[PDB]
Amino acid sequence: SVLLKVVFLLRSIVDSPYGDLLSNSIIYDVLQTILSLACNNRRSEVLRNAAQSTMIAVTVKIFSKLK
Amino acid sequence: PVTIIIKECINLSTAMPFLSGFIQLRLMLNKLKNLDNIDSLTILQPFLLIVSTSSISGYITSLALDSLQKFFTLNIINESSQNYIGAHRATVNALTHCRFDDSVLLKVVFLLRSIVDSPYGDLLSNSIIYDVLQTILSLACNNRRSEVLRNAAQSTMIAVTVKIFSKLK
């Protein structure tokens, strides 16, 4: 549940208007961490599903910035 | 483009009265040049028929909900679409009724979060948001489910409470 709170706050911070101000060397670290959470099968499956949905929800924001 | 919906239709067709509806949907959306005048309740009604009923295994429901989330995230339905208000009304309306192990419910909860937080959630009728709040509160209060799903329920209800009381201005 702590990691779910981590992932939820990551999504909340990145999606809000106070996410463009993040330095571009940091969002790579966020993506790497959510990937390391998602691929690892030792965690709970439902947490993995949450991480996957979070990572889609930030990937859409990242690639929409390419405009 | 709007070719995503036919792709999701063929993706969900591999389930081996609803398959006939989906194949009719594919034959209808052979048409090109955007969704156009289509009467957009029917562009995605068979997806709601999958989740609304209570006689289908969880795998197909998860696939249908993934398709719905894909449609919303890519924003297939927009202001230009005919009768978009009715479609976005119906999609929240169907999820409140019966469904379905726990990942399906989390998918429903995440889609509810994404729909309500967005601009289109403002267009929902005030008789419906009460049903959504009742459903999420039933998820949160109940303890038979897994704890992490309960925490997700907790967070979404906080978020939609902030979104609702912000409208009181």
CSV table of N, CA and C in Angstrom, one decimal, chain B residues 9-159:
chain,number,residue,atom,x,y,z
B,9,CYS,N,-12.0,-4.0,-31.6
B,9,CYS,CA,-13.1,-4.9,-31.9
B,9,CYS,C,-12.6,-6.3,-32.3
B,10,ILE,N,-11.6,-6.3,-33.2
B,10,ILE,CA,-11.0,-7.6,-33.5
B,10,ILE,C,-10.3,-8.2,-32.4
B,11,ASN,N,-9.6,-7.3,-31.5
B,11,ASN,CA,-8.9,-7.8,-30.4
B,11,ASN,C,-9.8,-8.5,-29.4
B,12,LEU,N,-11.0,-7.9,-29.2
B,12,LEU,CA,-12.0,-8.5,-28.2
B,12,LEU,C,-12.8,-9.7,-28.8
B,13,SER,N,-12.8,-9.8,-30.2
B,13,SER,CA,-13.6,-10.8,-30.8
B,13,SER,C,-13.1,-12.2,-30.5
B,14,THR,N,-11.8,-12.3,-30.2
B,14,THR,CA,-11.2,-13.6,-29.8
B,14,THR,C,-11.6,-14.0,-28.4
B,15,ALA,N,-12.9,-14.4,-28.2
B,15,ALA,CA,-13.4,-14.9,-27.0
B,15,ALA,C,-13.3,-16.4,-26.9
B,16,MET,N,-13.2,-17.1,-28.0
B,16,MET,CA,-13.1,-18.5,-28.1
B,16,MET,C,-11.8,-19.0,-27.6
B,17,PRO,N,-24.9,-13.7,-28.6
B,17,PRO,CA,-25.6,-12.5,-29.0
B,17,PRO,C,-24.7,-11.3,-29.0
B,18,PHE,N,-23.5,-11.3,-28.3
B,18,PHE,CA,-22.7,-10.2,-28.3
B,18,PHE,C,-21.7,-10.1,-29.4
B,19,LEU,N,-21.2,-11.3,-29.8
B,19,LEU,CA,-20.3,-11.4,-31.0
B,19,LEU,C,-20.9,-10.9,-32.2
B,20,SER,N,-22.2,-11.2,-32.4
B,20,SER,CA,-23.0,-10.7,-33.6
B,20,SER,C,-23.0,-9.2,-33.6
B,21,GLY,N,-23.2,-8.6,-32.4
B,21,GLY,CA,-23.2,-7.1,-32.3
B,21,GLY,C,-21.9,-6.6,-32.6
B,22,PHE,N,-20.8,-7.2,-32.2
B,22,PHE,CA,-19.5,-6.7,-32.4
B,22,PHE,C,-19.1,-6.8,-33.9
B,23,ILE,N,-19.5,-7.9,-34.6
B,23,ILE,CA,-19.2,-8.0,-36.0
B,23,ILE,C,-20.1,-7.0,-36.8
B,24,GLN,N,-21.3,-6.8,-36.4
B,24,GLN,CA,-22.1,-5.7,-37.0
B,24,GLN,C,-21.4,-4.4,-36.8
B,25,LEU,N,-20.8,-4.1,-35.6
B,25,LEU,CA,-20.1,-2.9,-35.4
B,25,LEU,C,-18.9,-2.7,-36.3
B,26,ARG,N,-18.1,-3.8,-36.5
B,26,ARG,CA,-17.0,-3.8,-37.4
B,26,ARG,C,-17.5,-3.5,-38.9
B,27,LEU,N,-18.5,-4.2,-39.3
B,27,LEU,CA,-19.1,-4.0,-40.7
B,27,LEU,C,-19.5,-2.5,-40.8
B,28,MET,N,-20.1,-2.0,-39.8
B,28,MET,CA,-20.6,-0.6,-39.8
B,28,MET,C,-19.4,0.4,-39.9
B,29,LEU,N,-18.4,0.2,-39.1
B,29,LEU,CA,-17.2,1.1,-39.1
B,29,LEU,C,-16.1,0.6,-40.0
B,30,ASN,N,-16.5,-0.1,-41.1
B,30,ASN,CA,-15.7,-0.1,-42.3
B,30,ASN,C,-15.5,1.3,-42.9
B,31,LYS,N,-16.5,2.1,-42.7
B,31,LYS,CA,-16.5,3.5,-43.2
B,31,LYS,C,-15.3,4.3,-42.8
B,32,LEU,N,-14.9,5.2,-43.7
B,32,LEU,CA,-13.7,6.0,-43.6
B,32,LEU,C,-14.1,7.5,-43.3
B,33,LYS,N,-13.1,8.4,-43.2
B,33,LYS,CA,-13.2,9.8,-43.0
B,33,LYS,C,-13.9,10.1,-41.6
B,34,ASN,N,-13.2,9.7,-40.6
B,34,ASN,CA,-13.6,10.0,-39.2
B,34,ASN,C,-14.9,9.3,-38.9
B,35,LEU,N,-15.3,9.3,-37.6
B,35,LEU,CA,-16.6,8.7,-37.2
B,35,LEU,C,-17.8,9.4,-37.8
B,36,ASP,N,-17.7,10.7,-38.0
B,36,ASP,CA,-18.7,11.5,-38.7
B,36,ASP,C,-20.1,11.4,-38.0
B,37,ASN,N,-21.2,11.6,-38.8
B,37,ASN,CA,-22.5,11.4,-38.2
B,37,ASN,C,-22.8,10.0,-38.1
B,38,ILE,N,-22.7,9.5,-36.8
B,38,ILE,CA,-22.8,8.1,-36.5
B,38,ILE,C,-23.7,7.8,-35.3
B,39,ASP,N,-24.2,8.8,-34.6
B,39,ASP,CA,-25.1,8.6,-33.5
B,39,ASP,C,-24.4,7.8,-32.4
B,40,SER,N,-23.4,8.5,-31.8
B,40,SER,CA,-22.3,7.9,-31.0
B,40,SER,C,-22.7,7.2,-29.8
B,41,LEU,N,-24.0,7.0,-29.4
B,41,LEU,CA,-24.3,5.9,-28.4
B,41,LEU,C,-23.9,4.6,-29.0
B,42,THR,N,-24.2,4.3,-30.3
B,42,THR,CA,-24.0,3.0,-30.9
B,42,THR,C,-22.6,2.7,-31.3
B,43,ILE,N,-21.7,3.6,-31.3
B,43,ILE,CA,-20.3,3.3,-31.7
B,43,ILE,C,-19.6,2.4,-30.7
B,44,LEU,N,-20.1,2.5,-29.4
B,44,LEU,CA,-19.5,1.7,-28.3
B,44,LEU,C,-20.5,1.1,-27.4
B,45,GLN,N,-21.7,0.9,-27.8
B,45,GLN,CA,-22.7,0.3,-27.0
B,45,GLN,C,-22.4,-1.2,-26.6
B,46,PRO,N,-22.0,-2.0,-27.6
B,46,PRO,CA,-21.7,-3.4,-27.2
B,46,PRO,C,-20.6,-3.6,-26.2
B,47,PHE,N,-19.7,-2.6,-26.1
B,47,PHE,CA,-18.7,-2.7,-25.0
B,47,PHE,C,-19.4,-2.5,-23.6
B,48,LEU,N,-20.4,-1.6,-23.5
B,48,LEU,CA,-21.2,-1.5,-22.3
B,48,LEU,C,-22.0,-2.7,-22.1
B,49,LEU,N,-22.5,-3.4,-23.1
B,49,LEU,CA,-23.3,-4.6,-22.9
B,49,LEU,C,-22.4,-5.7,-22.2
B,50,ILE,N,-21.1,-5.7,-22.5
B,50,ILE,CA,-20.3,-6.7,-21.9
B,50,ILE,C,-20.1,-6.5,-20.4
B,51,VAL,N,-19.9,-5.3,-20.0
B,51,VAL,CA,-19.6,-5.0,-18.6
B,51,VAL,C,-20.9,-4.9,-17.8
B,52,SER,N,-22.0,-4.6,-18.4
B,52,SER,CA,-23.3,-4.4,-17.7
B,52,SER,C,-23.9,-5.7,-17.2
B,53,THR,N,-23.8,-6.7,-18.0
B,53,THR,CA,-24.4,-8.0,-17.7
B,53,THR,C,-23.6,-8.7,-16.6
B,54,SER,N,-24.0,-9.9,-16.1
B,54,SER,CA,-23.4,-10.6,-15.1
B,54,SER,C,-23.4,-12.1,-15.4
B,55,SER,N,-23.0,-12.4,-16.6
B,55,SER,CA,-23.0,-13.8,-17.1
B,55,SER,C,-21.8,-14.0,-18.0
B,56,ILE,N,-20.7,-13.3,-17.8
B,56,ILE,CA,-19.4,-13.4,-18.6
B,56,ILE,C,-18.3,-13.4,-17.7
B,57,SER,N,-17.2,-14.2,-18.0
B,57,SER,CA,-16.1,-14.4,-17.1
B,57,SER,C,-15.3,-13.0,-17.1
B,58,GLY,N,-14.4,-13.0,-16.1
B,58,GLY,CA,-13.7,-11.7,-15.8
B,58,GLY,C,-12.7,-11.3,-16.9
B,59,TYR,N,-12.2,-12.3,-17.7
B,59,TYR,CA,-11.2,-11.9,-18.7
B,59,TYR,C,-11.7,-11.1,-19.8
B,60,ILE,N,-12.9,-11.4,-20.3
B,60,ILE,CA,-13.6,-10.6,-21.3
B,60,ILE,C,-13.9,-9.2,-20.8
B,61,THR,N,-14.4,-9.1,-19.5
B,61,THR,CA,-14.7,-7.8,-18.9
B,61,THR,C,-13.5,-7.0,-18.8
B,62,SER,N,-12.3,-7.6,-18.4
B,62,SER,CA,-11.1,-6.8,-18.4
B,62,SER,C,-10.7,-6.3,-19.7
B,63,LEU,N,-10.9,-7.2,-20.8
B,63,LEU,CA,-10.5,-6.7,-22.1
B,63,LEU,C,-11.4,-5.6,-22.6
B,64,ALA,N,-12.7,-5.6,-22.3
B,64,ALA,CA,-13.6,-4.6,-22.6
B,64,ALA,C,-13.3,-3.3,-21.9
B,65,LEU,N,-13.0,-3.4,-20.6
B,65,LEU,CA,-12.6,-2.2,-19.9
B,65,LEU,C,-11.3,-1.6,-20.4
B,66,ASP,N,-10.4,-2.4,-20.7
B,66,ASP,CA,-9.1,-1.9,-21.3
B,66,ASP,C,-9.4,-1.2,-22.6
B,67,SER,N,-10.3,-1.7,-23.4
B,67,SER,CA,-10.7,-1.0,-24.7
B,67,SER,C,-11.4,0.3,-24.4
B,68,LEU,N,-12.2,0.4,-23.4
B,68,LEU,CA,-12.9,1.6,-23.0
B,68,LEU,C,-11.8,2.6,-22.5
B,69,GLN,N,-10.9,2.2,-21.7
B,69,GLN,CA,-9.8,3.1,-21.3
B,69,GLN,C,-9.0,3.6,-22.4
B,70,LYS,N,-8.7,2.7,-23.4
B,70,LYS,CA,-7.9,3.1,-24.5
B,70,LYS,C,-8.7,4.2,-25.3
B,71,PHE,N,-10.0,4.0,-25.5
B,71,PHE,CA,-10.8,5.0,-26.3
B,71,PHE,C,-10.8,6.3,-25.5
B,72,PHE,N,-10.9,6.3,-24.2
B,72,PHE,CA,-11.0,7.6,-23.5
B,72,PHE,C,-9.6,8.2,-23.5
B,73,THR,N,-8.5,7.5,-23.3
B,73,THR,CA,-7.2,8.1,-23.2
B,73,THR,C,-6.8,8.7,-24.5
B,74,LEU,N,-7.0,7.9,-25.6
B,74,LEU,CA,-6.8,8.5,-26.9
B,74,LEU,C,-7.8,9.6,-27.3
B,75,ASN,N,-8.9,9.7,-26.6
B,75,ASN,CA,-9.9,10.7,-26.8
B,75,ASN,C,-10.6,10.6,-28.1
B,76,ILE,N,-11.1,9.3,-28.3
B,76,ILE,CA,-11.9,9.0,-29.6
B,76,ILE,C,-13.2,9.9,-29.5
B,77,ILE,N,-13.8,9.9,-28.4
B,77,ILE,CA,-15.0,10.7,-28.2
B,77,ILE,C,-14.6,12.1,-27.8
B,78,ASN,N,-15.1,13.1,-28.5
B,78,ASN,CA,-14.8,14.5,-28.3
B,78,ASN,C,-16.0,15.3,-28.4
B,79,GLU,N,-15.8,16.7,-28.3
B,79,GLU,CA,-17.0,17.6,-28.5
B,79,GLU,C,-17.6,17.5,-29.9
B,80,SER,N,-16.7,17.3,-30.9
B,80,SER,CA,-17.2,17.3,-32.3
B,80,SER,C,-18.1,16.0,-32.5
B,81,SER,N,-18.0,15.0,-31.7
B,81,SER,CA,-18.8,13.8,-31.9
B,81,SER,C,-20.2,14.0,-31.6
B,82,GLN,N,-21.1,13.5,-32.4
B,82,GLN,CA,-22.5,13.6,-32.2
B,82,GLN,C,-23.0,12.8,-31.0
B,83,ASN,N,-23.7,13.5,-30.1
B,83,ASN,CA,-24.3,12.8,-29.0
B,83,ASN,C,-23.3,12.3,-28.0
B,84,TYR,N,-22.1,13.0,-27.9
B,84,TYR,CA,-21.1,12.6,-27.0
B,84,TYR,C,-21.5,12.6,-25.5
B,85,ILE,N,-22.4,13.5,-25.2
B,85,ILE,CA,-22.9,13.7,-23.8
B,85,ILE,C,-23.6,12.4,-23.4
B,86,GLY,N,-24.5,11.9,-24.3
B,86,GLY,CA,-25.2,10.6,-24.0
B,86,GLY,C,-24.3,9.4,-23.8
B,87,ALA,N,-23.3,9.4,-24.6
B,87,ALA,CA,-22.3,8.2,-24.6
B,87,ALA,C,-21.5,8.3,-23.3
B,88,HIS,N,-21.0,9.5,-22.9
B,88,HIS,CA,-20.3,9.6,-21.7
B,88,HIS,C,-21.2,9.5,-20.5
B,89,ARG,N,-22.5,9.7,-20.6
B,89,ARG,CA,-23.4,9.4,-19.5
B,89,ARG,C,-23.5,7.9,-19.4
B,90,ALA,N,-23.8,7.2,-20.5
B,90,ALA,CA,-24.0,5.8,-20.4
B,90,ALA,C,-22.8,5.0,-19.9
B,91,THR,N,-21.6,5.4,-20.3
B,91,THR,CA,-20.4,4.7,-19.9
B,91,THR,C,-20.2,4.7,-18.4
B,92,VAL,N,-20.5,5.8,-17.7
B,92,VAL,CA,-20.4,5.8,-16.3
B,92,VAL,C,-21.6,5.1,-15.7
B,93,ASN,N,-22.8,5.2,-16.4
B,93,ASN,CA,-24.0,4.6,-15.8
B,93,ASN,C,-23.9,3.0,-15.8
B,94,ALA,N,-23.2,2.4,-16.8
B,94,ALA,CA,-23.2,1.0,-16.8
B,94,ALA,C,-22.2,0.4,-15.8
B,95,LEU,N,-21.1,1.1,-15.5
B,95,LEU,CA,-20.1,0.6,-14.6
B,95,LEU,C,-20.7,0.5,-13.2
B,96,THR,N,-21.7,1.3,-12.8
B,96,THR,CA,-22.2,1.3,-11.4
B,96,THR,C,-22.9,-0.1,-11.2
B,97,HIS,N,-23.5,-0.7,-12.2
B,97,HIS,CA,-24.3,-1.9,-12.0
B,97,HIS,C,-23.3,-3.1,-11.9
B,98,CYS,N,-23.8,-4.3,-11.9
B,98,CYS,CA,-23.0,-5.5,-11.6
B,98,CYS,C,-21.9,-5.7,-12.7
B,99,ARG,N,-20.9,-6.5,-12.3
B,99,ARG,CA,-19.7,-6.7,-13.1
B,99,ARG,C,-19.2,-8.1,-12.7
B,100,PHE,N,-17.9,-8.3,-13.1
B,100,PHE,CA,-17.1,-9.5,-12.7
B,100,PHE,C,-17.8,-10.9,-12.7
B,101,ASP,N,-8.8,-11.4,-10.3
B,101,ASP,CA,-10.2,-11.2,-9.8
B,101,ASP,C,-10.4,-9.7,-9.4
B,102,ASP,N,-9.6,-9.2,-8.5
B,102,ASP,CA,-9.7,-7.9,-8.0
B,102,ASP,C,-9.2,-6.8,-9.0
B,103,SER,N,-8.3,-7.2,-10.0
B,103,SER,CA,-7.8,-6.3,-10.9
B,103,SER,C,-8.9,-5.7,-11.8
B,104,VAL,N,-10.0,-6.4,-12.0
B,104,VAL,CA,-11.1,-5.9,-12.8
B,104,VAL,C,-11.7,-4.7,-12.1
B,105,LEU,N,-11.9,-4.8,-10.8
B,105,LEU,CA,-12.5,-3.7,-10.1
B,105,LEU,C,-11.6,-2.5,-10.0
B,106,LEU,N,-10.3,-2.8,-9.9
B,106,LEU,CA,-9.3,-1.6,-9.9
B,106,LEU,C,-9.4,-1.0,-11.3
B,107,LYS,N,-9.5,-1.7,-12.4
B,107,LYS,CA,-9.6,-1.1,-13.7
B,107,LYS,C,-10.9,-0.2,-13.8
B,108,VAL,N,-12.0,-0.7,-13.2
B,108,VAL,CA,-13.2,0.1,-13.2
B,108,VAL,C,-13.0,1.3,-12.4
B,109,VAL,N,-12.3,1.2,-11.3
B,109,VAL,CA,-12.1,2.4,-10.4
B,109,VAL,C,-11.2,3.4,-11.1
B,110,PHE,N,-10.1,2.9,-11.8
B,110,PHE,CA,-9.2,3.9,-12.5
B,110,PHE,C,-9.9,4.6,-13.6
B,111,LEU,N,-10.8,3.8,-14.3
B,111,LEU,CA,-11.5,4.5,-15.4
B,111,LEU,C,-12.5,5.5,-14.9
B,112,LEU,N,-13.1,5.2,-13.7
B,112,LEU,CA,-14.0,6.1,-13.1
B,112,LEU,C,-13.3,7.4,-12.7
B,113,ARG,N,-12.1,7.2,-12.1
B,113,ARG,CA,-11.2,8.4,-11.8
B,113,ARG,C,-11.0,9.2,-13.0
B,114,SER,N,-10.5,8.6,-14.1
B,114,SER,CA,-10.1,9.3,-15.3
B,114,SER,C,-11.3,10.0,-15.9
B,115,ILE,N,-12.5,9.4,-15.9
B,115,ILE,CA,-13.7,10.0,-16.5
B,115,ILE,C,-14.1,11.2,-15.7
B,116,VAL,N,-14.2,11.0,-14.3
B,116,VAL,CA,-14.8,12.1,-13.5
B,116,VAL,C,-13.9,13.3,-13.4
B,117,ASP,N,-12.5,13.0,-13.4
B,117,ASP,CA,-11.6,14.1,-13.2
B,117,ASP,C,-11.5,15.0,-14.5
B,118,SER,N,-11.9,14.4,-15.7
B,118,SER,CA,-11.7,15.2,-16.9
B,118,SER,C,-12.8,16.2,-17.1
B,119,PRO,N,-12.7,17.0,-18.2
B,119,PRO,CA,-13.8,17.9,-18.5
B,119,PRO,C,-15.1,17.3,-18.8
B,120,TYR,N,-15.1,16.1,-19.4
B,120,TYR,CA,-16.4,15.5,-19.8
B,120,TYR,C,-17.2,15.0,-18.6
B,121,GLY,N,-16.5,14.7,-17.5
B,121,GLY,CA,-17.2,14.3,-16.3
B,121,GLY,C,-18.1,15.4,-15.7
B,122,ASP,N,-17.8,16.7,-16.1
B,122,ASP,CA,-18.7,17.8,-15.7
B,122,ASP,C,-20.0,17.6,-16.4
B,123,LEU,N,-20.1,17.0,-17.5
B,123,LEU,CA,-21.4,16.9,-18.2
B,123,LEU,C,-22.3,15.8,-17.7
B,124,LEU,N,-21.9,15.0,-16.7
B,124,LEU,CA,-22.7,13.9,-16.2
B,124,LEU,C,-23.9,14.5,-15.4
B,125,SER,N,-25.0,13.8,-15.4
B,125,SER,CA,-26.2,14.2,-14.7
B,125,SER,C,-25.9,14.0,-13.2
B,126,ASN,N,-26.5,14.9,-12.4
B,126,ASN,CA,-26.4,14.9,-10.9
B,126,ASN,C,-27.1,13.8,-10.3
B,127,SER,N,-27.9,13.0,-11.0
B,127,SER,CA,-28.5,11.8,-10.4
B,127,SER,C,-27.5,10.6,-10.6
B,128,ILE,N,-26.4,10.7,-11.3
B,128,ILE,CA,-25.5,9.6,-11.6
B,128,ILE,C,-24.3,9.7,-10.7
B,129,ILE,N,-23.8,10.8,-10.4
B,129,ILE,CA,-22.6,11.0,-9.5
B,129,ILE,C,-22.8,10.4,-8.2
B,130,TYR,N,-24.1,10.5,-7.7
B,130,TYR,CA,-24.4,9.8,-6.4
B,130,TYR,C,-24.2,8.3,-6.5
B,131,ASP,N,-24.6,7.7,-7.6
B,131,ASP,CA,-24.4,6.3,-7.8
B,131,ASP,C,-23.0,5.9,-7.9
B,132,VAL,N,-22.1,6.7,-8.5
B,132,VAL,CA,-20.7,6.5,-8.6
B,132,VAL,C,-20.1,6.6,-7.2
B,133,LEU,N,-20.5,7.6,-6.4
B,133,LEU,CA,-20.0,7.7,-5.0
B,133,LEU,C,-20.4,6.6,-4.2
B,134,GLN,N,-21.7,6.1,-4.3
B,134,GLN,CA,-22.2,4.9,-3.6
B,134,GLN,C,-21.4,3.7,-3.9
B,135,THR,N,-21.0,3.5,-5.2
B,135,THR,CA,-20.3,2.3,-5.6
B,135,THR,C,-18.9,2.4,-5.0
B,136,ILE,N,-18.2,3.5,-5.1
B,136,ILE,CA,-16.8,3.6,-4.6
B,136,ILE,C,-16.8,3.5,-3.1
B,137,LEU,N,-17.9,4.0,-2.4
B,137,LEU,CA,-17.9,3.9,-1.0
B,137,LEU,C,-18.2,2.5,-0.5
B,138,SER,N,-19.0,1.7,-1.3
B,138,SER,CA,-19.2,0.3,-1.0
B,138,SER,C,-17.9,-0.4,-1.2
B,139,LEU,N,-17.1,-0.1,-2.2
B,139,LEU,CA,-15.7,-0.7,-2.3
B,139,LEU,C,-14.9,-0.4,-1.1
B,140,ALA,N,-14.8,0.9,-0.7
B,140,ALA,CA,-13.9,1.3,0.3
B,140,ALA,C,-14.3,0.8,1.7
B,141,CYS,N,-15.6,0.8,2.0
B,141,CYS,CA,-16.0,0.3,3.3
B,141,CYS,C,-15.8,-1.2,3.5
B,142,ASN,N,-16.1,-1.9,2.4
B,142,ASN,CA,-16.0,-3.4,2.5
B,142,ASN,C,-14.5,-3.8,2.7
B,143,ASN,N,-14.3,-4.8,3.6
B,143,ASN,CA,-13.0,-5.3,3.9
B,143,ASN,C,-12.7,-6.7,3.3
B,144,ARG,N,-13.6,-7.3,2.7
B,144,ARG,CA,-13.4,-8.6,2.1
B,144,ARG,C,-12.4,-8.6,1.0
B,145,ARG,N,-12.3,-7.4,0.3
B,145,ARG,CA,-11.4,-7.3,-0.8
B,145,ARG,C,-9.9,-7.2,-0.3
B,146,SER,N,-9.0,-7.1,-1.3
B,146,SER,CA,-7.6,-6.9,-0.9
B,146,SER,C,-7.4,-5.5,-0.4
B,147,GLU,N,-6.4,-5.3,0.4
B,147,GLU,CA,-6.2,-4.0,1.1
B,147,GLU,C,-5.7,-2.9,0.1
B,148,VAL,N,-4.9,-3.3,-0.9
B,148,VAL,CA,-4.3,-2.3,-1.8
B,148,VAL,C,-5.4,-1.7,-2.7
B,149,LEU,N,-6.4,-2.6,-3.1
B,149,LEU,CA,-7.6,-2.1,-3.8
B,149,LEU,C,-8.4,-1.1,-2.9
B,150,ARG,N,-8.5,-1.4,-1.6
B,150,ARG,CA,-9.2,-0.5,-0.7
B,150,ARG,C,-8.4,0.8,-0.6
B,151,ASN,N,-7.1,0.8,-0.6
B,151,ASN,CA,-6.4,2.1,-0.6
B,151,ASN,C,-6.6,2.9,-1.9
B,152,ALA,N,-6.6,2.1,-3.0
B,152,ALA,CA,-7.0,2.8,-4.3
B,152,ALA,C,-8.4,3.4,-4.2
B,153,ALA,N,-9.3,2.7,-3.6
B,153,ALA,CA,-10.6,3.2,-3.4
B,153,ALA,C,-10.6,4.5,-2.6
B,154,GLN,N,-9.7,4.5,-1.6
B,154,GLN,CA,-9.6,5.6,-0.6
B,154,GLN,C,-9.2,6.9,-1.4
B,155,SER,N,-8.1,6.7,-2.2
B,155,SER,CA,-7.6,7.8,-3.0
B,155,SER,C,-8.5,8.3,-4.0
B,156,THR,N,-9.2,7.5,-4.8
B,156,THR,CA,-10.2,8.0,-5.8
B,156,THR,C,-11.3,8.7,-5.1
B,157,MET,N,-11.8,8.2,-4.0
B,157,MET,CA,-12.9,9.0,-3.3
B,157,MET,C,-12.5,10.3,-2.8
B,158,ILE,N,-11.2,10.4,-2.3
B,158,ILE,CA,-10.7,11.7,-2.0
B,158,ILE,C,-10.7,12.7,-3.2
B,159,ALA,N,-10.2,12.1,-4.3
B,159,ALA,CA,-10.0,12.9,-5.5
B,159,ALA,C,-11.4,13.4,-6.0
